Amino acid sequence: MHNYVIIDAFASVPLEGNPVAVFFDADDLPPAQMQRIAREMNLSESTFVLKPRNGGDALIRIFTPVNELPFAGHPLLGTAIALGAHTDNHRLYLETQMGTIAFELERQNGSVIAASMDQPIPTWTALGRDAELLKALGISDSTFPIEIYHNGPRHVFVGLPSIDALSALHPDHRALSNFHDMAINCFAGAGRRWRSRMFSPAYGVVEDAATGSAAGPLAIHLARHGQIEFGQPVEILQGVEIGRPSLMFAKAEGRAEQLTRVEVSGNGVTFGRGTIVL
Amino acid sequence: HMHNYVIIDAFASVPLEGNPVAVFFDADDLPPAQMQRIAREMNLSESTFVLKPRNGGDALIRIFTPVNELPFAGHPLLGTAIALGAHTDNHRLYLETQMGTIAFELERQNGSVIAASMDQPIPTWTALGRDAELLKALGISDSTFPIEIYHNGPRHVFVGLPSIDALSALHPDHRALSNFHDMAINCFAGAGRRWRSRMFSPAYGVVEDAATGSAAGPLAIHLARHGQIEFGQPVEILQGVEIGRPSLMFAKAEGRAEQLTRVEVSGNGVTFGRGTIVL
Ligand SMILES: N[C@H]1C(C(=O)O)=CC=C[C@@H]1O
Ligand SMILES: N[C@H]1C(C(=O)O)=CC=C[C@@H]1O
């Protein structure tokens, strides 16, 4: 029987942010069973904590309702906050299929409030399917070039000219299903403060509340297209329209041709805790 | 303030099959606006909230999808009955809802509730009258029977498919279906005592539901009305296969079209997990 905790990632009060279910002592579970348990929980992702194989503190497998991912931001954030309660450490190294991800935990009197990660440095290229994507989304143009970024999963970015225009999107989900192994991230804002919405049939979600692996790439995207400075911290607020406001903090250091660090951080809180029968 | 919950997989005998529901105990201190938010947090087709009774039943149950409250629903109440069945020795349970009190008969094996049967509200029905629009949204050109909508709290439309292969081949346009408010679209195929279903409902916050217990009773009526079975004949409705959540519902509608005397729906259920929440 496995214990789990529900963490609300990128939130400072339960019922805000993006839930993840974090399953402990999962070494006895076959990957097909992990996928079934993820399907059962029906959250954007469930994670499984396994003994480390390469010098980290643990190995984390990450599942959507429909597939496994090699890296993801919100689920690893919540996993790191949940696992922080197990030890006194303020540095935590979590293994994933993209490599070992370093975390710094914000603790008060030993109690975990928040965490910060160094993400894999993404690569990118032009999407090459603009007219198809924009038709699906129900709009005419992107404010900036439409590019697709890879850090494990893939994330496409489409810019909107106002927050009201972002909120008014009603995408064709069936048409977005033609975009395999990627999530579609639509953004609007100014300066240090940005809003986002994410849609991904490929990753089993109509609309996601907090796409943490997209936050670091967005910071890169905004700097490459001259809207912010490299090294400038940004706030990205996602999930407002669906009633799940989630605050992600991101900073990309270096320059377009040579990035040195892609940091994403947030608060997280425990919503609940329990046990499953298998 | 803290609340205990159980996850019941309804219309299944083993975990990871059927349709999950989260059942929250001693929920009187939660305002409906907070219940709605908890249901979204769980993200299951429904969560239910167990309140003290007001009209001589055992409990009053409020039922929420991820986006709205419903006055009655089958799967969530089956799971609620099985969960509450662990706390009692009684053979029957009476659950108050916005639709009235729903009677359940509990089935035990060893010391343990493994299944239950409910008497549902008797539905009303009519044609939907929007065949062209609905069929377009579904991606097909007609239905094998008249397209009709039944009301037992929620509303359920039925669209018939000529084969199970044709049913599994549906790839509906969720956005176009969102123009159908306050209803679920139930697509069916099969023969005799054996039927397959798929349900789609942007109105009730689900792309595709695994087991729509409030649709099982009405489908039995619809099949009888349209001469595919006899009134009083029990049927087996298998839902959720294409999404990896196979769920078996048993239904019987007794009487005649002009006067239904009982609409019974039953099924197995099993506990998948339990826990506590911080509000
Ligand atoms: N939570 C999202 C995610 C993330 O990085 O948080 C990656 C891919 C899809 C999930 O819905
Ligand atoms: N499980 C379904 C339900 C039911 O009766 O089980 C009614 C309406 C929509 C839900 O997804």
UniProtKB/Swiss-Prot annotation, chain B:
GO terms for cellular component: cytoplasm. Pathway: Antibiotic biosynthesis; phenazine biosynthesis. It catalyses: (5S,6S)-6-amino-5-hydroxycyclohexa-1,3-diene-1-carboxyate = (1R,6S)-6-amino-5-oxocyclohex-2-ene-1-carboxylate. GO terms for biological process: phenazine biosynthetic process. SUPFAM superfamilies: Diaminopimelate epimerase-like (SSF54506). It holds the Pfam family PhzC-PhzF. One of its GO terms (molecular function) is trans-2,3-dihydro-3-hydroxy-anthranilate isomerase activity. Keywords: Antibiotic biosynthesis, Isomerase, Virulence. The active site is at 46. InterPro entries: Phenazine_PhzF-like. Belongs to the PhzF family. Isomerase that catalyzes the condensation of two molecules of trans-2,3-dihydro-3-hydroxyanthranilic acid (DHHA) into the phenazine ring system. The final product is not yet known. This is Trans-2,3-dihydro-3-hydroxyanthranilate isomerase.
